[PDB]
Enzyme design. Structure first.
Site, mmCIF file in Angstrom:
data_model
loop_
_atom_site.group_PDB
_atom_site.id
_atom_site.type_symbol
_atom_site.label_atom_id
_atom_site.label_comp_id
_atom_site.label_asym_id
_atom_site.label_seq_id
_atom_site.Cartn_x
_atom_site.Cartn_y
_atom_site.Cartn_z
ATOM 1 N N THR A 71 5.149 40.799 87.275
ATOM 2 C CA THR A 71 4.425 41.315 86.402
ATOM 3 C C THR A 71 3.256 42.330 86.788
ATOM 4 O O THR A 71 2.254 41.939 87.423
ATOM 5 C CB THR A 71 3.744 40.429 85.117
ATOM 6 N N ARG A 93 3.820 37.178 68.050
ATOM 7 C CA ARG A 93 4.040 38.803 67.916
ATOM 8 C C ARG A 93 3.587 39.244 66.758
ATOM 9 O O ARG A 93 3.498 38.598 65.676
ATOM 10 C CB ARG A 93 5.372 38.986 68.486
ATOM 11 N N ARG A 118 17.242 39.958 85.743
ATOM 12 C CA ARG A 118 16.731 39.022 84.846
ATOM 13 C C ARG A 118 16.847 39.688 83.474
ATOM 14 O O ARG A 118 17.035 40.736 83.064
ATOM 15 C CB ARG A 118 15.155 38.955 85.192
ATOM 16 N N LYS A 138 7.443 28.826 84.166
ATOM 17 C CA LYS A 138 6.836 29.943 84.429
ATOM 18 C C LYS A 138 5.409 29.370 84.067
ATOM 19 O O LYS A 138 5.391 28.756 83.117
ATOM 20 C CB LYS A 138 7.040 31.218 83.453
HETATM 21 O O1 LIG Z 1 6.387 36.320 80.815
HETATM 22 C C1 LIG Z 1 6.123 37.252 81.898
HETATM 23 O O2 LIG Z 1 6.902 37.777 82.514
HETATM 24 C C2 LIG Z 1 4.541 37.452 82.198
HETATM 25 O O3 LIG Z 1 3.801 37.023 81.005
HETATM 26 O O4 LIG Z 1 4.092 37.853 83.054
HETATM 27 MG MG LIG Z 2 4.674 36.038 79.529
#
Ligand SMILES: O=C([O-])C(=O)[O-]
Ligand SMILES: [Mg+2]
Ligand SMILES: O=C(c1ccc(NS(=O)(=O)c2cccc3cccnc23)cc1)N1CCN(c2cnccn2)CC1
Ligand SMILES: O=C(c1ccc(NS(=O)(=O)c2cccc3cccnc23)cc1)N1CCN(c2cnccn2)CC1
Ligand SMILES: O=C([O-])C(=O)[O-]
Ligand SMILES: O=C([O-])C(=O)[O-]
Ligand SMILES: [Mg+2]
Ligand SMILES: [Mg+2]
Lengths: 518, 518, 518
Positions: free
Chosen positions: B315, B107, B60, B257
């Site tokens: 994560t 950010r 990744r 995601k």
């Molecule tokens: O974007 C990511 O990898 C997350 O927030 O877990």
């Molecule tokens: Mg994220």
């Protein structure tokens, strides 16, 4: 839909998973007991009060360290904070006290006797291990003392030795009559009096050392509710603990900590002999490969659920919260999964004993467990626990399962159980109802010990016994209704299940009533 | 016994848990894909080779940081390391490249002025935050920088805003017209360029920003296998990612995601539109309450398993390994439970991008996955997927469930599948066999994309097509036999299942053979 | 809808029952074998032609009566009838010839002397039984003879004796040295040469008598397909029969008839030793209390299904159809519930042997079976048959279960199996597909024997072996296709499952294909 009741109606586990819903708020009740280790961060009376408010149910005393007088004062502060809420019996929350024994620990000695002194062991270097006390306080990069006299008898050329919670590892190259010559395998900075693990070694230390004998006797005199007996390897170890406590401590629950391979292999006989089991993941993950721990954890929780005995999931649950005010995603996941696994209780160690966020850790445990109880697939869990439980002629057992069945059918706000020894409530808990189990008792000890059982919200009736049995039952039942309404388990007009004995002094809890909340 | 086959035979899920056995070793095959974030600690050709050997299947690249030139170098190195094994086509492991878009991030900036590195703010403190853009160089414990314009179009006073993996909690004491003063609640160590979350706001930032457009186009130019689209809130977000990739990048897999409340709530339309799903727990555990993540995780894996689409759990799975060579016990549990949940792939981020033990991390995931895959209760899983399967006249579907059934009956060493697009292998994987799936393909891209499916070990056959069907089929079968033998999946005399078509092309898989290994 | 497909998608057995629909017409194919007893009423080549047309699969000859030359005639007429349809190989139905041994029958002697008169006995009256051969031809209402010398040794005062297939009940009131004095329980006309039963008495006639031996040997000369062995009490019984059939008749199926208490008590060893079982309910219902018959029926069908061995349900199924052209309600129910029990075959005795309506009996079984087979809850049946069948290394077993799995997945018109010995087709049938199993064989004998297995429609190929294996498979496959189209099992464009082997010879079935009907 509330408390994942949409997922609860699913005919398959898979569909049950597909229906879990982050917008389906849980009930207010939290069924899983929360056990906290007390130390510097959490031993003040004022801090303990907040621990109780946040959800602590049992205080764990780690007798690996501290003097009797130091623990005597920890016990006092716990009782002081717990009693400070006793003025309102409706809102009072019993707090159990548990004592965690040192057991057969193996510890190194002092490094150059300085305190701020460590040595950086280099991978591939040789290190001598001696047992000669003249070196007791003179440890360095070449010589290392430790307190296990017979270590040479149970170790072989090629054996591995872990030091400091497994951070350093050594491999034995030579044996002398009473020393070992090792090679450093995993290098590290070694401090003083650190823990030693010998995976796969038939360690021949006593189940109950002389010190433990004293420690257990101290516990009896201080009226502790339960003992967490470290390093239990076999049924005979449990019987030893049982015999020490003796007649005076007969009602103290013994919880065997399974923390090595032997305990895992002998698990069935240990379970038969103990009142409960702690999965001690710390030592266990050192004694067996870390990638295999989850299997042991699931196996032990399964068998306890099957047997009907409490099981505590322990160690490193919210580890990163020792330093941080929020946990990792893996930690959130590990707590929930211990609940879904079937753990009666979850435990905090360093998070409460020494860390910087003891209260936030307790709070997080309470919040996660609550979510996870809502997500349990009761339909299958209830079908299976029945199928695996025997035909009995015990009337209170039949009554208990009839009541759980009934609580699923009318979706009741609680199961109110009148109990002296707590047994009737335990027999209800083993069938895992969704409704909280409000165990009304007059025996202060049974109230504290009930925290070990998933679902039991224990409640201490302070009212003196009325002579008219029927009236005394009513008093205790009505007290449960009042506790429930106050904590928001249910409100007037809701339906609850109430379990009581039929005859004055029968010793049976053999009567179930389905009853609207007044 | 071996591979938890004793637990495999159990009639109930409870009894299956009771039988899990730490002395029952797993098979050598590992079904769960491992995706590694490549960064400073792992982007050298030498480290990468080790990553591949340790078990990395997908590299990744996180486009939140870095230039196009930086990433092309990394891609280059991943290819160089991957192709370094191409000399023996029996040992070559295809490695996918994934592009993770920045998406609608918010950010922060640098530090103080004397050193733009790392500083702090105290607990309970107050903090000025700016909607003007001059103070980015000098951001300290007093006056801090964000990058979001129409903020107070969607914000409130006393509303929660989080910072730096939400380790920093702040509530806005007061606002104004468009600027921020607040008060610290969870005080900690403040760093540089840290992320910001606004739980509750239906933020107005675009799904595919201008920068995303450049990154996606770069992604096409570079021949990437897949895109991880950040912050997907709905199906039209996915279609706009698909539109930007266009004709040229039409074979690139889009993985949505899910990392905020809306994505969870609109999960169904998103799944239908995507090629697969990532449960992005980092942001998800800030956007929704931390205690609710596991529910969102198990729901999404459930629905993906039901739909037959790849799901990645991501994560903080091995977070503490950023600094330590061993994981915590909660981390062991988490990886294991993601696999038992049904996750096709597990992911590492910081652990491999920037930590001190990237190789240890990959290896720990490899070991846990394997143990967890053996502990799966296939009996119930296979039954439920079959019941929750819409019946079809599709011949390829019938052959595929036939094959999985056959592989259980004879406990086979593998299911060998010949596939051009991968579809055939995907159809077998969705029924979750215990045996690894050796998907033999001539298409390098499908070989790389297949890593997304639990159980698929993709192998790239580099030999020219042969004129006779039968012989070309037998040469690809034999290639798969040799890979499996070479990887220790099975040996001479073992039984495998083999799935093939009646002639060349896609959608023709209709033949299943039970075959001994020569 | 059709074939209760609505009911077969139900998630519970109760829901399944609820959805059974008298208006849901079944599929044309009838899976359950039909066995008919040939007698006076049905041995003409002409009646035998209509029996076949009506669905008879097996012609059973009882050897308690008639000469060898008589039975050889009956056999020849069965064969003539069977071969009349042979001109068209696509429509021809193999028909099996079964030999049912006399066994240890007990029979009375001749009544009165005036040919075959029928003395009537009265409730309360005294009767005497004697072995005095003087009354061998001179039985009457006062004194009766039978052919069992040791009756006095094995009977006691209180014993019940039954005459004329259970019609007349007698109680032993007085035992002599040579004779028994009994009191009649219920009236009724007594014929000559009638059958006698002694419940709860250790009868010691050989299970394989000298008559039995000649008969079995005759079977061999006549090339019968199977033996139905009367009054099998234990495994050694079955082994004697296998010995007599010897080398010459090794390919002949032995079906043990369970007709008494011991046969049921030692059922497991008998099954192991046998090729199949007949639940022979006439004698069984006299030997054990009538209210227990259904328990033993359901036990033996269950066990045979679990072992994958043929079981036949027999006797008094359509009893009233000896004298009437429509059955009773009890009889409609009994045929359907035997099919629902799991029986591979159903049987007719007097109905087809001596009744006024042989053809009406055969049709009524054909119709009831086909209705009942659609009412089968396949979901749970197939799930259970899986769980409870071993994990085996045998490839042909994996292929077999794979194919049944596939046939449910795509609702196929048939499962086509190429078999030499029949075993491949037997292996499929034990998983109870809904779809008819077309077993294509070149062996006339396996074609006939296949009728024992639920769901197998045998077809016999007459074509010559083709030199090229690949083409010789397709020839037989295509024959099954043509057979299926003519029989209305499926049509062009339907999907069927085809099982073939990788080389010529038995034990090499390993290949399943899902294939459109051309
Ligand atoms: O974007 C990511 O990898 C997350 O927030 O877990
Ligand atoms: Mg994220
Ligand atoms: O996350 C869960 C899960 C959810 C709830 C769980 N606990 S439970 O509802 O109380 C439960 C339900 C049924 C039986 C149980 C036996 C022991 C302990 N808990 C049981 C346990 C696990 N999964 C179980 C079902 N899943 C699988 C995994 N493998 C095969 C089949 N289904 C996906 C993940
Ligand atoms: O009529 C039936 C019946 C229906 C179908 C039957 N055969 S079946 O569908 O192939 C079947 C289905 C499932 C398991 C079987 C095991 C052995 C033999 N057959 C099985 C057998 C019996 N039953 C009466 C009502 N039944 C109920 C209904 N509700 C609760 C309990 N039993 C099921 C049995
Ligand atoms: O003792 C403990 O608690 C452990 O090792 O986990
Ligand atoms: O012999 C028989 O077939 C019987 O008794 O049913
Ligand atoms: Mg320990
Ligand atoms: Mg008989």
């Amino acid at each position: 839909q509330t408390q994942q009741l949409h997922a609860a109606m699913a005919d398959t586990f898979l569909e049950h998973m597909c229906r879990l819903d982050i917008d389906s708020p849980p009930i207010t009740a939290r069924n899983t007991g929360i056990i906290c280790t007390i130390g510097p961060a959490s031993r003040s009376v004022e801090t303990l009060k907040e621990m109780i408010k946040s959800g602590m149910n049992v205080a764990r005393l780690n007798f690996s360290h501290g003097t009797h007088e130091y623990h005597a004062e920890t016990i006092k502060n716990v009782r002081t904070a717990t009693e400070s809420f006793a003025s309102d019996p409706i809102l009072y929350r019993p707090v159990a006290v548990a004592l965690d024994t040192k057991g057969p620990e193996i510890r190194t000695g002092l490094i150059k006797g300085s305190g701020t002194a460590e040595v950086e062991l280099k991978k591939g270097a040789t290190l001598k291990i001696t047992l000669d006390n003249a070196y007791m306080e003179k440890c360095d990069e070449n010589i290392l003392w430790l307190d296990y006299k017979n270590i040479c008898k149970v170790v072989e050329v090629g054996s591995k030795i872990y030091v400091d919670d497994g951070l350093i590892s050594l491999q034995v190259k030579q044996k002398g009559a009473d020393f070992l010559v090792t090679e450093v395998e995993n290098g590290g900075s070694l401090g003083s009096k650190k823990g030693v693990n010998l995976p796969g070694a038939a360690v021949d230390l006593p189940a109950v050392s002389e010190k433990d004998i004293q420690d257990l006797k101290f516990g009896v005199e201080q009226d502790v509710d339960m003992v967490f007996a470290s390093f239990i390897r076999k049924a005979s170890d449990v019987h030893e603990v049982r015999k020490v406590l003796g007649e005076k401590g007969k009602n103290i629950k013994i919880i065997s900590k399974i923390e090595n391979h032997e305990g895992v292999r002998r698990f069935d006989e240990i379970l038969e002999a103990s009142d409960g089991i702690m999965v001690a993941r710390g030592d266990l993950g050192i004694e067996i490969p870390a990638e295999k721990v989850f299997l042991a954890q699931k196996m032990m929780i399964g068998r306890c659920n099957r047997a009907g005995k409490p099981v505590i999931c322990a160690t490193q649950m919210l580890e990163s919260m020792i330093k941080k005010p929020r946990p990792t995603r893996a930690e959130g996941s590990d707590v929930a999964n211990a609940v879904l696994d079937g753990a009666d209780c979850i435990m905090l160690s360093g998070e409460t004993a020494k860390g910087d966020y003891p209260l936030e850790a307790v709070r997080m445990q309470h919040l996660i467990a609550r979510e996870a109880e809502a997500a349990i697939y009761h339909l299958q869990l209830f079908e299976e626990l029945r199928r695996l439980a025997p035909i009995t002629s015990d009337p209170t057992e039949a009554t208990a399962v009839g009541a759980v069945e009934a609580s699923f059918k009318c979706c009741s706000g609680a199961i109110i159980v009148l109990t002296k020894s707590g047994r009737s409530a335990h027999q209800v808990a083993r069938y895992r109802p969704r409704a909280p189990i409000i165990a009304v008792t007059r025996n202060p000890q049974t109230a504290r010990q009930a925290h070990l059982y998933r679902g039991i919200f224990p409640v201490l009736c302070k009212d003196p016994v009325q002579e008219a049995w029927a009236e005394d039952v009513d008093l205790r039942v009505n007290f449960a209704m009042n506790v429930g309404k106050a904590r928001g388990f249910f409100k007037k007009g809701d339906v609850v299940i109430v379990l009581t004995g039929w005859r004055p002094g029968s010793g049976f809890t053999n009567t179930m009533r389905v009853v609207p909340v007044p």
